[PDB]
Amino acid sequence: WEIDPKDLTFLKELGTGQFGVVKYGKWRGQYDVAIKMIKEGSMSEDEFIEEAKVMMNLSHEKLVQLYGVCTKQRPIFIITEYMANGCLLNYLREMRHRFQTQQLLEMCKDVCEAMEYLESKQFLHRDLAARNCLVNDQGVVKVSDFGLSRYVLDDEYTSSVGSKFPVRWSPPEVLMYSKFSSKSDIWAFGVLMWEIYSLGKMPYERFTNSETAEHIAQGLRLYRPHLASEKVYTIMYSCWHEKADERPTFKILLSNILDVMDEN
Ligand SMILES: CN1CCn2nc(Nc3cc(-c4cccc(NC(=O)c5cc6ccccc6s5)c4CCO)n[nH]c3=O)cc2C1
């Protein structure tokens, strides 16, 4: 899906990410979109365009929808489904005192549904976290920026000892051997559940990344947030098995989440 940049209208600056400036605009004067303007040197562009077809085939309600790309010009554009309430982490922090427990679980469910679908397509996110989930005007959470980490050119982000690497969302096998799998996405999802139920707190606060790597290797895990039931915590904790093959699938996690709902 190559978009014609003439069909795009820029309206507002939405901020900055790993690829640079992100803008809000419209496609053909009607559809609200987000447009990532890829800073030169920030992306492995050839490698991205080479593997763009598969991202185009990924479609799910709880996945942020890709509209298309603009590659006949520089900077490259990536155009996506706009989400009015922005990223989940700040949404949690900003609406912290308004959340009911049922809502926190529905958020987990939204995300898990998306990841189950990705799991089914053998597609990895690689940087799952609240900051890379977005929220729309009706409070629906959707998974964002799935797979883009592979294309980042920044040693501080690509290196496990880098300052931007998602250490706090990474299992031991990633920090040690850089072995990404479904089960690394699983681990990350548990940390995400923790972000949700803690209402936007930073994992392992006052720990450095290295200290965090040290302690999870030694078996330390994130404490149960006040608003998390024991049933809920058991779900997120199951994502943090030292051994990846003892970790559940997203299909199972979703069943767990549904069972907790049903009981309530
Ligand atoms: C008043 N509020 C201001 C902030 N805000 N943001 C909104 N909604 C969106 C933000 C982004 C956005 C903004 C800044 C940075 C990033 N993130 C990135 O640019 C990147 C994230 C990652 C993750 C891994 C690897 C590479 C990248 S690039 C995004 C998500 C773009 O997909 N994208 N799409 C939206 O709908 C809505 C609001 C209303």
UniProtKB/Swiss-Prot annotation:
Entry's free-text remark on domains: The PH domain mediates the binding to inositol polyphosphate and phosphoinositides, leading to its targeting to the plasma membrane. It is extended in the BTK kinase family by a region designated the TH (Tec homology) domain, which consists of about 80 residues preceding the SH3 domain.
Lineage, broadest ranks: Eukaryota, Metazoa, Chordata, Craniata, Vertebrata
GO terms for biological process, alphabetical: adaptive immune response; apoptotic signaling pathway; B cell activation; B cell affinity maturation; B cell receptor signaling pathway; calcium-mediated signaling; cell maturation; cellular response to interleukin-7
Effect noted on mutating residue 14 to P: In XLA; moderate
Effect of residue 219 to D: In XLA; mild; interferes with substrate binding and/or domain interactions
Subcellular location(s) per record: Cytoplasm; Cell membrane; Nucleus; Membrane raft
Source organism: Homo sapiens (Human)
Catalytic site positions: 127
Positions of modified residues (Phosphoserine): 210, 229
Chief localization: cytoplasm
Motif (CAV1-binding): 187-194
Entry comment on modification after translation: Following B-cell receptor (BCR) engagement, translocates to the plasma membrane where it gets phosphorylated at Tyr-157 by LYN and SYK.
Subunit relationships: Part of a complex composed of EEIG1, TNFRSF11A/RANK, PLCG2, GAB2, TEC and BTK; complex formation increases in the presence of TNFSF11/RANKL. Binds GTF2I through the PH domain. Interacts with SH3BP5 via the SH3 domain. Interacts with IBTK via its PH domain. Interacts with ARID3A, CAV1, FASLG, PIN1, TLR8 and TLR9. Interacts with MPL/TPOR.
Function recorded in the entry: Non-receptor tyrosine kinase indispensable for B lymphocyte development, differentiation and signaling. Binding of antigen to the B-cell antigen receptor (BCR) triggers signaling that ultimately leads to B-cell activation. After BCR engagement and activation at the plasma membrane, phosphorylates PLCG2 at several sites, igniting the downstream signaling pathway through calcium mobilization, followed by activation of the protein kinase C (PKC) family members. PLCG2 phosphorylation is performed in close cooperation with the adapter protein B-cell linker protein BLNK.
Similarity comment text for this entry: Belongs to the protein kinase superfamily. Tyr protein kinase family. TEC subfamily.
Annotated disorder: X-linked agammaglobulinemia: Humoral immunodeficiency disease which results in developmental defects in the maturation pathway of B-cells. Affected boys have normal levels of pre-B-cells in their bone marrow but virtually no circulating mature B-lymphocytes. This results in a lack of immunoglobulins of all classes and leads to recurrent bacterial infections like otitis, conjunctivitis, dermatitis, sinusitis in the first few years of life, or even some patients present overwhelming sepsis or meningitis, resulting in death in a few hours. Growth hormone deficiency, isolated, 3, with agammaglobulinemia: An X-linked recessive disorder characterized by growth hormone deficiency, short stature, delayed bone age, agammaglobulinemia with markedly reduced numbers of B cells, and good response to treatment with growth hormone.
UniProt tissue specificity: Predominantly expressed in B-lymphocytes.
Effect recorded for residue 173 to K: In XLA; severe
Annotated binding of ATP, by residue: 14-22, 36
Modification type Phosphotyrosine: residues: 157, 223
Keyword vocabulary terms for this entry: Acetylation, Adaptive immunity, Apoptosis, ATP-binding, Cell membrane, Cytoplasm, Disease variant, Dwarfism, Immunity, Innate immunity, Kinase, Lipid-binding, Membrane, Metal-binding, Nucleotide-binding, Nucleus, Phosphoprotein, SH2 domain, SH3 domain, Transcription, Transcription regulation, Transferase, Tyrosine-protein kinase, Zinc, Zinc-finger
Protein name: Tyrosine-protein kinase BTK
GO CC annotation terms, alphabetical: cytoplasm; cytoplasmic vesicle; cytosol; membrane raft; nucleus; perinuclear region of cytoplasm; plasma membrane
UniProt binding sites for dasatinib: 80-83
